[PDB]
Amino acid sequence: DLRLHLLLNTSVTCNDGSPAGYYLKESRGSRRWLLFLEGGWYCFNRENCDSRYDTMRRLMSSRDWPRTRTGTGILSSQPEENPYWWNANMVFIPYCSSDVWSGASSKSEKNEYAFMGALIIQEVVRELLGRGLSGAKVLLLAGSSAGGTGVLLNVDRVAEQLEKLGYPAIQVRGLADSGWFLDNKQYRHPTEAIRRGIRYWNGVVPERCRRQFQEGEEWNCFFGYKVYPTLRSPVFVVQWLFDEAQLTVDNVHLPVQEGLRLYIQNLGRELRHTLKDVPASFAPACLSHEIIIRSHWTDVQVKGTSLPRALHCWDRSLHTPLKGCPVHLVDSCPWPHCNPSCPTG
């Protein structure tokens, strides 16, 4: 139900110089716009980007993209599948820049690949303004995995873009799903990959975070607990306490012995600690990865509240806590699937 539009400014490109784009399903009368950033890791040098180009080419090129995509989860237009925003205008922005949505570098003479993630978002917003976004009341920039980190890196830039373009009535907000990572010690054997990626991509981070960390240290701004306090736009954070991608980068692969048990328990407790002062958050004690565009995203609950409900409560809070409509939902139990509603697998 979402139709592909390749960017009219064809200088804003995927990694291989093909045009970037977006999938759109309009909902006339709705003044709510959901722009979702796809995830899918990243690449940070010629050799690993070349490998990703052989066997993950849709993440680097629009040449083979389909005409349409079905909106699922939070992008579904069916209230049964999406109790939260089923009537919104829906936008799916494919991830084809491999740069955690941070890049501002064109393909050229010196560059085999273009890394334009930050410019793709800006150009999508530009072109949507002529398609009804000019009349929006809320623009929710959402994303999963690298797209969730992309929300953190870009939500305030979208807000500033719209202000400078003359649309101060559009409330820009972020929903970062599975993009809140820790730069922690591995269990055996991201920081270095991000440092190199930033140079390779000409990667950009939010201004206030950049001013805190300074040159050479912008990689810090890819870590939610460091960049979030610098952001002005409201951001709702969804993060499994035992995220599979966090565990992968930590070199954990799941009878668990004491060292690994302590490592896993400490990871959950560190994640919980980083979310203590995040007032809009949903952090279930599960071993899993991403949630918001899965068709059964409605099933998980924390303290008896689902994510669609928590997001609805967040909308109400942005009109003092609300009776029976909580927005801060972080599990306190210490082991994967101590929450009975965790995804089964």
- Three-state SS letters, the chain: CEEEEECCCCCCECCCCCECEEEEECCCCCCEEEEEECCCCCCCCHHHHHHHHHHCHHHCCCCCCCCEECCCHHHCCCCCCCCCCCCCEEEEECCCCCCCCCECECCECCECCCECHHHHHHHHHHHHHCCCHHHCCEEEEEEECHHHHHHHHHHHHHHHHHHHHCCCCCEEEEEEECCCCCCCCCCCCCHHHHHHHHHHHCECCCHHHHHHHCCCCHHHHHCHHHHHHHCCCCEEEECCCEEHHHHHHCCCCCCCCHHHHHHHHHHHHHHHHHHCCCCCEEECCCEECCCCCCCCCCCCEECCEEHHHHHHHHHHHCCCCCCCCCCEEECCCCCCCCCCCCCCC
Considering the candidates 30, 61, 99, 289, report the single residue annotated as catalytic.
289
Considering the candidates 99, 156, 177, 243, report the single residue annotated as catalytic.
243
Single out the residue of 303, 237, 305 nearest to residue 271, CA to CA. Answer: 237
Burial of 103 (0-12, 13-18, 19+ CB in 10 A): buried
Judge whether 145 counts as a catalytic residue.
yes
Q: Determined by which method?
A: X-ray
Spatial separation of the C-alpha atoms in residues 25 and 68, rounded to whole Å: 10
Contacts 24+ apart (CB under 8 A), 268-275: 268/241, 268/242, 268/334, 268/335, 269/334, 270/182, 270/184, 271/180, 271/182, 271/239, 271/241, 272/241, 272/330, 272/331, 272/332, 274/180, 274/182, 274/224, 274/225, 275/180, 275/237, 275/239, 275/330
Burial of 249 (0-12, 13-18, 19+ CB in 10 A): middle
In the chain, the N- to C-terminal Cα span, in Å, equals 27
Answer for the pair 289, 247: CB distance below 8 angstroms, yes or no. Answer: no
Considering the candidates 30, 97, 144, 145, report the single residue annotated as catalytic.
145
Judge whether 253 counts as a catalytic residue.
no
Answer for the pair 222, 146: CB distance below 8 angstroms, yes or no. Answer: no
Q: At what angle do helices 146-165 and 117-129 cross, to 10 degrees?
A: 50
Q: 47 Cβ partners below 8 Å, 6+ apart? A: none
Give the distance, in angstroms, between the CA of residue 188 and the centroid of all CA atoms in the same chain.
Answer: 27
Angstrom resolution of this structure: 1.2
Neighbours of 99 (CB within 10 A): 32
Judge whether 289 counts as a catalytic residue.
yes
Single out the residue of 145, 184, 176, 152 nearest to residue 270, CA to CA. Answer: 184
Strand partners, 108: 111
